[PDB]
């Protein structure tokens, strides 16, 4: 489709890969290891996926707590127009589907 | 007995959540705060924790602005207060971007309380040990809200929180009047703070902020000195 | 392919919005004394109307008050700019009164949401370069509802089969269908 | 002391949490199912009736599709979740392929869904048991039962819930080929089986009927009382 | 999948249908709605005590109490970019307690324009005053910036560059700087909005407060 | 004991103790009442936030509007009730957007009870300590009244009560409710009598009614003057009755 | 993961009946495990940091033992507490300064760096998987508009700005001494600031100092770069006190 679809879909992953590669080259193997441990730990305390979360700790760790982008004001995910059944979404999150 | 005291996601056999009561106990042992809603204005006052000559007087503040017409104060733990303040500022900016008008006070209070309600229903985290007093001016009409560690908010005319807040609320009940001016409200707030200071009160150990039709602002120490001299 | 034309005029404590009928609905009510008219592709008009109704209902339930025309304009602009790269083929026109002051408001937007607020009239649709000069020639300020209806009817009619006109007042709303003799 | 976790075996090879879920099932209202030559009947006991309650909202018999219906015993919210999932699955399957859904297919789907929830320590099993009846494409009646563990079987007549053993023994004694010859006799057999444990007949008995190429029919109290009166009359005649 | 939680951002659900529809309409010969564009002349200079921005007729956008911007191109894009940057700078100033710097706004605008690979299409002229003096930039839709003492964009750009390279001197006073900008704008069009930022009207020692706006 | 620390544990006799403990949290909350009549539905609640230094800046407390045709009342934990009410509004709007028709009253209750049941099904989370009463109107069954509990159960009623001292109120409603022969005025009088027994001033109650006029649903909240009129009428009729 | 430990002082995310966090309070006690104390003093146009240097082993290379670090060209640091934790925080602070420079186009200020570190430290006290570091940071720098700066952050996530501060085993006596001196006199020259810091250390610890037992770093308005003094300069200052 549009050339911008794939770029916008996976922006955060590519940013993480670039920063992690630079950090590994400058400091060593321990710094990305610690960063990934912290991200995994804080990304584990949230609401069940059919409700709306806030991700306060993850935003504090990642540095997104004084920045607003186009993904924060356009097509607000809190007021989504489609939502599945609760049990189905929880099962899909765990990989059973 | 103590089996239901450690876990946040465990109900007591009588249907009580105890860690939330303990977070409120953490709040009740903080520095006193006072808020009074008068006609044509609101006043917030608090007691500083840095009572020494070595501390710098312009580094960290307890009264903060969120928007041009919204202010904040707290009792409890400061590190939680900072992150809550940052999130509130971001929410206000998002609302302005979407709707092209300043956010109302009630909507911001609702959003902050929604953020605070989470962290009380999940395992692996702890609730925020802090309460907030929120003031604002909107549609020619002042507001004063309070938010709890559990995520519940109330609308007040005058309240006190922190240490010795029961006696402060009794004092406010005795002294508060409906047809009050902002200057008299500031006088009454300072008098309420003075009831439990345990020391000598100057302009370097209290902080005052007011809100009116011109917006929210924090008073300079010289103005606080002038107000104190008038007592 | 036909898209139609939509105009709105403002007078003394009143406002009107008009379109061309005979085929689908173009003018939708968004609350009391507030309307929006859409001209363009048939499916996009209905999709935009339904999504706008969704957002408006949620906003009015949460806030506890009625919406203002400026806030509705901002919401429409946000919804349209969402689809910046593949856009909707619609051109909204908004007309209504202030729910607490009863002051007229008219504006129009492009297909991605660039607003334009005027004080006399505004025109949308594909043939937007023809009713313009006629609208300046036939418009004067301080106009009562009867003369306002007559003026907007003439401007909508003798510029291009039938038309439909809504006249909004503080008390009542009048709907009329017209056909040239 | 091996009953604190879902996925823990006991020294003699038992999973105790699933058995406790079965215990939760064993405390619901009794449900009875009988299949005949051209009819299938379901009956459910009504535990108690409150006068200020709307009885339409507390029914224990539902219709999954046009050729299948189900009754349950156990917890009610879990049953509602399972019913909704099965209905959505039937609708999706019918939309994708125009063939009618098979009763064995829907039973297998329900059993697989139930068995999924006994595999991890982070979720608990469903505490319900279900009875499923219907007619296939060729008109062959069927009757199945499902368990909280995920197993299923096929029966000719079965009972679940509180006081199920006595009903099953009565059915074993009285289920013959000359007792299912007619629809009225089948319905009378179901009512008589239910009457072993129900204190007052008709007052708190709910019964459903399904015939071939026909929609599900819920009998009214007038018909239920008429059948009970016929049973009483034949009992009086046979008293002697 | 349909069970995945929703996310925000732009939507690309109409691109194929739109391409087919425009191809069909162009081949058959019918018209479709178009975006609004602006192409007037914008210019700015640097004098001894601040910046002077000019445009022909607002078209001068507010970014900060000490920073202003002028745009050319699609109107909606310029509006959205300026408002987003203004909100981000307000958050930054609330956190820091100081007035912002021009290089911060330049960096944020350049990075955000580069992220979208020139599809936004906004050309901007940025200028302001901070604790290090006055600065002036020029930003292009693909994400390229130049730091120059005088810039111009729009339709009558060449007629303005002629005047600039003919009659520009370093360290001018406010009045003749305004006059020079006025002549440069008037040459291109053949009624003019001017914005003047001065270091003497700003206090860089006072703690920051939210402006009226 | 050893079986009451998680929501994903069955006791040897097949019980979930955490759900029962959660339902124990509703007996401490304020009293909520609901009555169904031939030409309307009623909702009466008790105000716990009573104090001299409290402000009144909202439409009402413990009574919320869900859409053009429905309303609810809550009892339990306020912060959980807020989440539940927001989700109810979202569900109703989604159904309207998809089908271009208003949602039936029972489907909304079922959809919320599914969410309430998921939080007892999955581990690591805490069940909601909230109970709700619903009133509304739709073209399939007319006026309706439902009730819900923390476990995810619901049912239809003609008169019910939740909160503090619910059993006595239920007994009185059972004694004094006439089926099929009551109007809105009779329902208001009965609600006043039952609340007076179970708990009286106009500042401690809040009443809302639902009705149909010209093919349009009207939702109102009664005023202080009307509440005082009802209270004084009840007092005078009680005095007249006891004088004989 | 592993699972929390029952008790009112055995897990990070459990409040006590009085509303206290005993694991945070215990992490505050790890700062005294090293056995050393440090002092930071702010002057009229300079800022200094002084700490003591203990080398107990004869076979240990003394040039590899230090507690003074350089974050950026214009920011200095002194760490007190657990050594590995201190070094990890120094690395994290350098990373955060690099991110700020890349994102905003100019060098990070001292208060902003301290606030960022405190924000990161706050998260460790609210999640059950990570633990606080047992160390405290003190930063100095020269601000273009304000001047000298002294800042400090602690394991709880709390930070503040000071005129003079101390950390370590004997923080309280140093605080009292500095409070008396500050209430007495202001407007110190560059020499007087070092004199005051060394006097505070040598009075709180009843020791006569040698040039090899202390470590001094300085920043000044004329030369805003962080600098570490040498033994000759330290001995010159010591004889200046001695005379």
Swiss-Prot record, chain A:
GO terms for biological process: proteasome assembly. One of its GO terms (cellular component) is cytosol. A motif (High-affinity association with the preproteasome) lies at residues 24-28. It is found in: Cytoplasm, Cytosol; Nucleus; Microsome membrane. It comes from the Eukaryota. Strongly expressed from the basal layer to the granular layer of healthy epidermis, whereas in KLICK patients there is a gradual decrease of expression toward the granular layer. Induction: By IFNG/IFN-gamma. Keywords: Chaperone, Cytoplasm, Endoplasmic reticulum, Ichthyosis, Isopeptide bond, Membrane, Microsome, Nucleus, Palmoplantar keratoderma, Ubl conjugation. Signal peptide: none annotated. Molecular chaperone essential for the assembly of standard proteasomes and immunoproteasomes. Degraded after completion of proteasome maturation. Mediates the association of 20S preproteasome with the endoplasmic reticulum. Constituent of preproteasomes, but not of mature 20S proteasomes. Within the preproteasome, may directly interact with PSMB1/beta6, PSMB4/beta7, PSMB5/beta5, PSMB6/beta1 and PSMB9/beta1i. Interaction with PSMB8/beta5i has been observed in PubMed:10973495, but not in PubMed:10926487. Forms tetramers. Belongs to the POMP/UMP1 family. This is Proteasome maturation protein. It comes from Homo sapiens (Human).
Swiss-Prot record, chain B:
Gene3D superfamilies: Glutamine Phosphoribosylpyrophosphate, subunit 1, domain 1. Induction: Down-regulated by antioxidants BO-653 and probucol. Down-regulated in response to enterovirus 71 (EV71) infection (at protein level). PANTHER family: PROTEASOME SUBUNIT ALPHA/BETA (PTHR11599). The modification N6-acetyllysine is found at residues 68, 169. The lineage of its organism: Eukaryota, Metazoa, Chordata, Craniata, Vertebrata. The modification Phosphoserine is found at residues 5, 12, 14. Component of the 20S core proteasome complex involved in the proteolytic degradation of most intracellular proteins. This complex plays numerous essential roles within the cell by associating with different regulatory particles. Associated with two 19S regulatory particles, forms the 26S proteasome and thus participates in the ATP-dependent degradation of ubiquitinated proteins. This is Proteasome subunit alpha type-2. It comes from Homo sapiens.
UniProtKB/Swiss-Prot annotation, chain D:
Component of the 20S core proteasome complex involved in the proteolytic degradation of most intracellular proteins. This complex plays numerous essential roles within the cell by associating with different regulatory particles. Associated with two 19S regulatory particles, forms the 26S proteasome and thus participates in the ATP-dependent degradation of ubiquitinated proteins. The modification N6-acetyllysine is found at residue 226. The keyword Nucleus applies. The 26S proteasome consists of a 20S proteasome core and two 19S regulatory subunits. The 20S proteasome core is a barrel-shaped complex made of 28 subunits that are arranged in four stacked rings. The two outer rings are each formed by seven alpha subunits, and the two inner rings are formed by seven beta subunits. The proteolytic activity is exerted by three beta-subunits PSMB5, PSMB6 and PSMB7. PSMA7 interacts directly with the PSMG1-PSMG2 heterodimer which promotes 20S proteasome assembly. Interacts with HIF1A. Interacts with RAB7A. Interacts with PRKN. Interacts with ABL1 and ABL2. Phosphorylation by ABL1 or ABL2 leads to an inhibition of proteasomal activity and cell cycle transition blocks. Pfam families: Proteasome (PF00227), Proteasome_A_N (PF10584). One of its GO terms (cellular component) is nucleoplasm. Induction: Down-regulated by the ribozyme Rz3'X. Up-regulated in colorectal cancer tissues. It comes from Homo sapiens. Glycans are attached at residue 129. The keyword Glycoprotein applies. The modification Phosphotyrosine is found at residue 152.
UniProtKB/Swiss-Prot annotation, chain G:
The modification Phosphotyrosine is found at residue 158. Its main location: cytoplasm. One of its GO terms (cellular component) is proteasome core complex, alpha-subunit complex. CDD domains: proteasome_alpha_type_6. Keywords: Acetylation, Cytoplasm, Glycoprotein, Nucleus, Phosphoprotein, Proteasome. It holds the Pfam family Proteasome. The keyword Glycoprotein applies. The 26S proteasome consists of a 20S proteasome core and two 19S regulatory subunits. The 20S proteasome core is a barrel-shaped complex made of 28 subunits that are arranged in four stacked rings. The two outer rings are each formed by seven alpha subunits, and the two inner rings are formed by seven beta subunits. The proteolytic activity is exerted by three beta-subunits PSMB5, PSMB6 and PSMB7. Interacts with ALKBH4. Belongs to the peptidase T1A family. This is Proteasome subunit alpha type-6.
């Amino acid at each position: 489709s549009h050339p911008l679809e794939l770029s916008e879909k996976n922006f955060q992953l590519n940013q993480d890969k670039m920063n992690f590669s630079t950090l590994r080259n400058i400091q060593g193997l321990f710094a990305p290891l610690k960063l990934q441990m912290e991200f995994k730990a804080v990304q584990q305390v949230q609401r069940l996926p059919f409700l709306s979360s806030s991700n306060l700790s993850l935003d504090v760790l990642r540095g997104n707590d004084e920045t607003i982008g186009f993904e924060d004001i356009l097509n607000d995910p809190s007021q989504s127009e489609v939502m599945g059944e609760p049990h189905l979404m929880v099962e899909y999150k765990l990989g059973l589907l | 007995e103590r089996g239901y005291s450690f876990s946040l996601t465990t109900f007591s056999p009588s249907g009580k959540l105890v860690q939330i009561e303990y977070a409120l106990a953490a709040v009740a042992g903080g520095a006193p705060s006072v808020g009074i809603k008068a006609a044509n204005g609101v006043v917030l006052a608090t007691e500083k924790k840095q009572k020494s000559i070595l501390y710098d007087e312009r580094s960290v503040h307890k009264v903060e602005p969120i928007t041009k017409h919204i202010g904040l104060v707290y009792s409890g733990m400061g590190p939680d207060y900072r992150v809550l303040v940052h999130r509130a500022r971001k929410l206000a900016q998002q609302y302005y971007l979407v709707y092209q008008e300043p956010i109302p006070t009630a909507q911001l209070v609702q959003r902050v309380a929604s953020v605070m309600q989470e962290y009380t229903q999940s395992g692996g985290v702890r609730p925020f040990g802090v309460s907030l007093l929120i003031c604002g001016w909107n549609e020619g009409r002042p507001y004063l809200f309070q938010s709890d560690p559990s995520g519940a908010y109330f609308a007040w005319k005058a309240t006190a929180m922190g240490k010795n807040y029961v006696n402060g609320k009794t004092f406010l009940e005795k002294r508060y009047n409906e047809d009050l001016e902002l200057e008299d409200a500031i006088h009454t707030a300072i008098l309420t703070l003075k009831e439990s200071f345990e020391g000598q009160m100057t302009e370097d150990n209290i902080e005052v902020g007011i809100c009116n039709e011109a917006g929210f602002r924090r008073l300079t120490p010289t103005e606080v000195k002038d107000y104190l001299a008038a007592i | 392919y036909n898209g139609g034309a939509v105009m709105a005029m403002k007078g003394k404590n009143c406002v009107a919005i008009a379109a061309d009928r005979r085929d689908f609905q173009k003018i939708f009510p968004m609350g009391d004394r507030l309307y929006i008219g859409l001209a363009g592709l048939a499916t996009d008009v209905q999709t935009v109307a339904q999504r706008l109704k969704f957002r408006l209902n949620l906003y009015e339930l949460k806030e506890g008050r009625q919406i203002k025309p400026y806030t509705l304009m901002s919401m429409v602009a946000n919804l349209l700019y969402e689809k910046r790269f593949g856009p909707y083929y619609t051109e909204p026109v908004i007309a209504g009164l202030d729910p607490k002051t009863f002051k007229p408001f008219i504006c129009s937007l492009d297909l991605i949401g660039c607003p334009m607020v005027t004080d006399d009239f505004v025109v949308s649709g594909t043939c937007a370069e023809q009713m313009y000069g006629m609208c300046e020639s036939l418009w004067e300020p301080n106009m009562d509802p009867d003369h306002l209806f007559e003026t907007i009817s003439q401007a909508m009619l003798n510029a291009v089969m039938g038309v439909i006109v809504h006249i909004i007042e503080k008390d009542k709303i009048t709907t009329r269908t017209l056909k040239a003799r | 002391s091996y009953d604190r976790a879902i996925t823990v075996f006991s020294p003699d090879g038992h999973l105790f949490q699933v058995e406790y879920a079965q215990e939760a099932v064993k405390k619901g209202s009794t449900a009875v199912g009988v299949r005949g030559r051209d009819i299938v009947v379901l009956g459910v006991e009504k535990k108690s009736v409150a006068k200020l309650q709307d009885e339409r909202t507390v029914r224990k018999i539902c219709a999954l599709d046009d050729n299948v219906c189900m009754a349950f015993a156990g917890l009610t919210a879990d049953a509602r979740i399972v019913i909704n999932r099965a209905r959505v699955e039937c609708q999706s399957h019918r939309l994708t392929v125009e063939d009618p859904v098979t009763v064995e297919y829907i039973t297998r789907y329900i059993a697989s869904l139930k068995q999924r929830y006994t595999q991890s320590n982070g979720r608990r099993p469903f505490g319900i048991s279900a009875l499923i009846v219907g007619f296939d494409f060729d008109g062959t009646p069927r009757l199945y039962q499902t368990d909280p563990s995920g197993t299923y079987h096929a029966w000719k007549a079965n009972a679940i819930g509180r006081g199920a053993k006595s009903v099953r023994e009565f059915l074993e004694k009285n289920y013959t080929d000359e007792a299912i010859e007619t629809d009225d006799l089948t319905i009378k057999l179901v009512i008589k089986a239910l009457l072993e444990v129900v204190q007052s007949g008709g007052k708190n008995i709910e019964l459903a009927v399904m015939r071939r190429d026909q929609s599900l029919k819920i009998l009214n109290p007038e018909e239920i009382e008429k059948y009970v009166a016929e049973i009483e009359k034949e009992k009086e005649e046979n008293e002697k | 999948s349909v069970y995945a939680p929703p996310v925000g951002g732009f939507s690309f659900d109409n691109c194929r249908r739109n391409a087919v529809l425009e191809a069909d309409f162009a081949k058959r010969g019918y018209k479709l709605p178009k975006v609004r564009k602006t192409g007037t002349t914008i210019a700015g200079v640097v004098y001894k005590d601040g910046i002077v921005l000019g445009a022909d007729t607002s078209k001068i956008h507010f970014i900060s109490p000490n920073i202003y911007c002028c745009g050319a191109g699609t109107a909606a894009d310029t509006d959205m970019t300026t408002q987003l940057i203004s909100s981000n700078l307000e958050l930054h100033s609330l956190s820091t307690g100081r007035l912002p710097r021009v290089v911060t706004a330049n960096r944020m605008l350049k990075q955000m324009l580069f992220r979208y690979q020139g599809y936004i299409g906004a050309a901007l002229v940025l200028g302001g005053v901070d604790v290090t003096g006055p600065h002036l930039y020029s930003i292009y839709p693909h994400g390229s910036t130049d730091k120059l003492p005088y810039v111009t964009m729009g339709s009558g750009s060449l007629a303005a560059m002629a005047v600039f390279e003919d009659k520009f001197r370093p360290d001018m006073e406010e009045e003749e700087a305004k006059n020079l900008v006025s002549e440069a704008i008037a040459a291109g069009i053949f009624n003019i909005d001017l914005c003047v930022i001065s270091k003497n009207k700003l206090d860089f020692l006072r703690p920051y407060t939210v402006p009226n706006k | 004991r050893r079986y009451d620390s998680r929501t994903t544990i069955f006791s040897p006799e097949g019980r979930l103790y955490q759900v029962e403990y959660a339902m124990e949290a509703i007996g401490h909350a304020g009293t909520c009442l609901g009555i169904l009549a031939n030409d309307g539905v009623l909702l009466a609640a008790e105000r716990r936030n009573i104090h001299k230094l409290l402000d009144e800046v909202f439409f009402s407390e413990k009574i919320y509007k869900l859409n053009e045709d429905m309303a609810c009342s809550v009892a339990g934990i306020t912060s959980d009730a807020n989440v539940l009410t927001n989700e109810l509004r979202l569900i109703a709007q989604r159904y309207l957007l998809q089908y271009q028709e208003p949602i039936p009253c029972e489907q909304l209750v079922t959809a919320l009870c599914d969410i309430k049941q998921a939080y007892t099904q999955f581990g690591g989370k805490r069940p909601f300590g909230v109970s709700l009463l619903y009133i509304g109107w739709d073209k399939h069954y007319g006026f309706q009244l439902y009730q819900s509990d923390p476990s995810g159960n619901y049912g239809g009623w003609k008169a019910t009560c939740i909160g503090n001292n619910s059993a006595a109120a239920v007994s009185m409603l059972k004694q004094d409710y006439k089926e099929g022969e009551m109007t809105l005025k009779s329902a208001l009088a009965l609600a006043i009598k039952v609340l007076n027994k179970t708990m009286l001033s106009a500042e401690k109650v809040e009443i809302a009614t639902l009705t149909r006029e010209n093919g349009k649903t009207v939702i109102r909240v009664l005023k202080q003057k009307e509440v005082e009129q009802l209270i004084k009428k009840h007092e005078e009729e009680e005095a007249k009755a006891e004088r004989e | 993961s592993r699972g929390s430990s029952a008790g009112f002082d055995r897990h990070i995310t459990i409040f006590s009946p009085e509303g206290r966090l005993y694991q945070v309070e215990y992490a505050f006690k790890a700062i005294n495990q090293g056995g050393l104390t440090s002092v930071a003093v702010r002057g009229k146009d300079c800022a200094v940091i002084v700490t003591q240097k203990k080398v107990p082993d004869k076979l240990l290379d003394s040039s590899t033992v230090t507690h003074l670090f350089k974050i950026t060209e214009n920011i200095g640091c002194v760490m007190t507490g657990m050594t590995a934790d201190s070094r990890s925080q120094v690395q994290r602070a350098r990373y955060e300064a690099a991110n700020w420079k890349y994102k905003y186009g100019y060098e990070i200020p001292v208060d902003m760096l301290c606030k960022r570190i405190a924000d990161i430290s706050q998260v460790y006290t609210q999640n059950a998987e990570m633990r606080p570091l047992g160390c405290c940071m003190i930063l100095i720098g020269i601000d273009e508009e304000q001047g000298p700066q002294v800042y400090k952050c602690d394991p709880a996530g709390y930070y503040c700005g000071f005129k003079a501060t101390a950390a370590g085993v004997k923080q309280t006596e140093s605080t009292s001494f500095l409070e008396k001196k500050v209430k007495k006199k202001f407007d110190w020259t560059f020499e007087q600031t070092v004199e005051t810091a060394i006097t505070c250390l040598s009075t709180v610890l009843s020791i006569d100092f040698k040039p090899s037992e202390i470590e001094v770093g300085v920043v000044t308005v004329e030369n805003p770069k962080f600098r570490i003094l040498t033994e000759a300069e330290i001995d010159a200052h010591l004889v200046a006190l001695a005379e």
